[model samples]
Target chain A: NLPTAQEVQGLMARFIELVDVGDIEAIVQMFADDATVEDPFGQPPIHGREQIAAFFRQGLKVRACLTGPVRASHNGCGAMPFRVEMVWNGQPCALDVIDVMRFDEHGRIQTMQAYWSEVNLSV
Target chain B: NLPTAQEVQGLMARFIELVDVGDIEAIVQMFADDATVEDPFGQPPIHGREQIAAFFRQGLKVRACLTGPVRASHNGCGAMPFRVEMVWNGQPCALDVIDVMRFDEHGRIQTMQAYWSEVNLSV
Candidate 1:
């Protein structure tokens, strides 16, 4: 069965929360061990658990952050999940977060992939 | 069968073209008659073709424009398609376009639900 809307929301929400709380480990756990993250700025995709963990570790220093939700829509079959856009700061900079996750038979996230924009501090 | 990456890329490319060419009618036709568009300012969804056309009509008056590709990734099954981020002008303003499109068996767009940020001229 497909994951419910609430579950997907939770996944995205918790991901944000982990960022806010600066819980680097929890943030890393959200992804599959071999998950991939693609972002702007041509930084190479973060692959595997250790690399992904290090990526979030680098973000822990950002101070005075604000994130606002844009929208979420699910395609019927299952994959290609919702799109979420949030402003990172006063800058017109926006982050487009696309999250794709597979659920276990019990509906827990089994694998996931995400793509977002690099937070433009200069904006 | 899942849509290959090329097919998804085509969907997004054409969507951008429709906007740049200012083909309001064709643009309206790209979406389901009941498609919804959510923007930052709380403007109601441009449900149906007529309203969608009207929204684009209003935009055609402003001539300056630029759109740059950001990213695209397909999720597992089908539903949520991809996210594209583009800057609307030389200003710091940005638009985050969340595209959720469903394809028919023949790979034609059956429906599309998009959410984007308004083009902020004040930036």
Candidate 2:
């Protein structure tokens, strides 16, 4: 069955909140054991909870703020657009990103893909 | 190298344009012969060229406009946020949606999934 739009939006918002507060452990719990995280999409994806944990272990060290409503689909997937305020190479930068997450029937994130590039960044 | 942000943006921008203009014919050509489209995510996907063309024939009537910039990834994919300005059941309505598309190496759209729900529609 598909998740309601509110459910998807709540889950996605919690993700941003976790990243904003730097809660790596809580963030890790949101994913399935076999989840895939391709933070920049085109690059090779990091597979499984073990690998996912290893990756997020470094932390979502950027300031994340939701920029728009979380979009949900009837197929248990959601995409949220947001801005990442960070300092790259010692200069302040703002990056626009859209992250798509497919959730399992149990509400665990099954796959995650991030959309963004240098072109979306500004210093 | 992966597809550039401008390249992805230009394609997606044109897609939004074709939808607004209701050019179903040109829009169908943008996809691969074996492409898949899930216009509302939770619903079943429409596969292959013939089916995709038919889906668009009905979709072309909707009025749409971009709500924000197209977010592109390092890979050949992008996410676009937009609004469908429509009249439902003779009542004015506005729908918030985000569309995610993955392009084939040859630049044809390989897959497209739209995210939205009744919750996103306004009175």
Candidate 3:
């Protein structure tokens, strides 16, 4: 059975909290063992918990802030629009990003895809 | 002001109706003249109405079926998950796809991104 809207909302809240704190391990644990993450949608997918954890650990080096509420559908899909504010290589930077996630029957993320563009990055 | 949830819902419904009929030109007109589409995320974006129209015309050669309802937030962001079912090179194929669209102040699509993978395609 699919997750209820309330369950999906709760999952998103926890995900945001973990991401904001840069708890890479905790965030990785949110996914199923065989889950896949495609950070930019078009790139090759990072499969399994080990690779997914490594990817997030490297990507979350910068601080992230949720720009809006996490909206979810009844079928356990959630979308979050956020911004990453940080300094990279002595340059101040901000990027607008949106991530869409699909959860499995166990309420673990089955797929996670982030959408953003270099054009949206201010440096 | 951002579009209301109702307005976004209506736009998504119309979008689905147009895509169902393979009306590529109508689909392109729903986007802002300066809009960009990054289908599958990582590919270089298709910019402007003319390029967007061409991209859709080539892509919609296959039949599409909406597998679920389109969900939108009040901020003019909508997500729809659907399936493309058709024959490709004498082979039967079905692919699952999810698209996220962000609307501009004029309520025209400013950015549209589709997420899917070959792994999700059955041939």
Candidate 4:
């Protein structure tokens, strides 16, 4: 692994914390220049730092908390489970999510895919 | 998405249940004919049913349990968190793992990638 699993694990933790704090610029720095963001997966990915920063500007909305420790792969990637607590449309709800991030040699995230569906959104 | 998130979610649940029960052949049925398995994510992938079945045979000698609900993507894929609880080398250990599964058009799992590293091992 270009980035040892320990390093990847730390990066994953930091990435989520950035999101939780709504630090858009910090989150953007964690990605490679050509990195792709596929939040929710299956959707068209947003490329480049500018577009990704814009994407997170809206996601800063989550009062999120980690449900478990980040699971790092033998390679340069990690998966983490978290919950977004919110009052959606005036109803209290929580969305369960899992994010898998693959990193480049420089330890910058090369690709990020968030796993969650409509079924995961509820009290 | 060929398989709706609901369909994929149930499949993921079934897949983990099979593992928890140590049902080898049944686990194989969840995959397509030419599926690949990359447990732990950095090693070479095991191809074909025969090779993959053998892979699981060794795994069932060990045991694990689901740690949380399966998280589904908007696409034909899902991620699930699990823990392998075992007394390894004479010590109690629990390894945190996240498995990401991508499915084929017919809903059979086309790829399986497990995310974990030594850092996830707790004793």
Candidate 5:
């Protein structure tokens, strides 16, 4: 495990903590300078730290408090990335989501996309 | 453009071709031997080539042809992965899906996961 599970866990923890506290700077810094995030539901995608920080700020306005117990699991042998499993509170609904975060050679998150199912909350 | 769009497109094309042909060996070989896949709907997860191959066999029985025009887009400055957007036909219905695939240093696919919105077919 060149990129140890502990390292992945730390990243995941920081992400959750930052989001919970609405720390836009820390959240933006977590990503590489040239990073892209695509919202699965066909919304306009966000790229780069500036746009990403703006997105986070806007998101925090609508979904004021983001709380989740995030767990990170490793996949693949070489250049393994981590997936975060947790549920967050959103304005429209509560989200049970999986975020797949992949980092670059510099150990900065290059791309992280979330997969969430709101319907699961009904059950 | 170190890992150019053309290379990503080739990877997506090969993935679709392999899945369409039901070439389990080729499909399994595309994934890193120690990869993990988690189904979003709470189904049992699959890890490693052997289990993943078996899962494909069972899936192929239920869904004969995996047809999709996969498109790959670059994300991030370094170590970027591509996402495939396409529609696949299955026994139940057609699936509008996006699959995210990330590779290792060896150019072998390290991890890949699919996200499908079945309800979108209604519209």
Candidate 6:
């Protein structure tokens, strides 16, 4: 069965909370064992639990805030619009980002992709 | 002021319809004069009306279908997840893509970004 909207919302809430708190392990644990992630369109995907975890550990050091409510489809896909505040190359920067995630039946993320642009970043 | 949900939905419907028909001129007219586009992040943006129009003209040669409804924020930003059915390098292929668009006060698109990966493409 597909996840209900409430279920997906709950999952996204926890995901954002973990990200904001910089809980790398907890964030990685939200994915299924064989989950895959591609932060941008052109990059190679990071696969499996171990690699996915390491990818997040290196990338999730910044503070993030959800700019809008999470919306989901019955088929376990969700979209979240957010803003990330961080220091990049010693310059304080902020980026507007949108992430699309597909969840497994168990509510773990099966795939996640993020969309953003340098043009959307403010330095 | 932000656009109403109905208005944003209307805009997206028309946008998708134009894309489906490969009407490059009409698609380009949907953006403001100085609008920008960045597909797949990490790349330099295509700026202004002419370049953005040229970009879409080159890209809309393929067939695309919306896989989900468009979700929008109160601040004139929207996310759409879709699938493209086409041939690449003489091979049949399909890809899952997500795009985020931000609109100006006049309801014209100001910036648009697409997010997808080779991992999401199937041959």
Top model number, TM-score: 4
DockQ of each: 0.08, 0.68, 0.04, 0.79, 0.04, 0.05
The interface root mean square deviation of candidate 3 comes to: 12.2
Instruction: Give one digit per residue, the lDDT tens place, for model 1 in B49-101.
Output: 67767877866522222133323434311222223333446544333334545
Any runs in candidate 5 off by more than 4 Å, and if so which? Answer: A41-44, A61-93, A117-123, B1-123
Name the docking class for model 6: incorrect
Q: What is the lDDT of residue A71 in candidate 6?
A: 54
**DockQ category of candidate 5:** incorrect
- lDDT values for all models: 0.47, 0.85, 0.75, 0.86, 0.51, 0.74
Q: C-alpha displacement of A88 in model 6, angstroms?
A: 1.4
Over B21-95, each residue of candidate 6 has an lDDT whose tens digit, in order, gives 888999989998999887753357899999988888777747776665565545576676677787877997986
Chain A TM-scores for all candidates read 0.57, 0.92, 0.91, 0.91, 0.67, 0.92
- Per-residue CA lDDT of candidate 3, range B70-119, in tens? 55554567666667787888888986666798898888999987765453
Give the clashing pairs for model 2: A42-B75, A74-B42, A75-B42
TM-score of each: 0.41, 0.89, 0.54, 0.93, 0.42, 0.54
Say which prediction, candidate 1 or candidate 5, comes out ahead on DockQ: 1
Model 4 Cα lDDT, one tens digit per residue, A1-123 = 368888987888887788788778888899999899998888889999889888888666467777888988767888999888878677888899999899999999999999998889886
TM-score of chain B of each: 0.55, 0.92, 0.90, 0.90, 0.66, 0.91
Q: Spell out the clash pairs found in candidate 3.
A: none
For residue A73, model 5's alpha carbon misses the true position, in angstroms, by 6.0
What's the distance in Å from true for residue A29, model 3?
Answer: 0.3
**Residue B82 accuracy (lDDT) in model 3:** 68
Poorest 10 consecutive residues by lDDT, candidate 1 chain B: B75-84
Task: Sum up the clashes in candidate 3.
Answer: 0
Candidate 3 structure lDDT = 0.75
- What is the Å distance of residue A97 in model 5 from its true position? 1.9
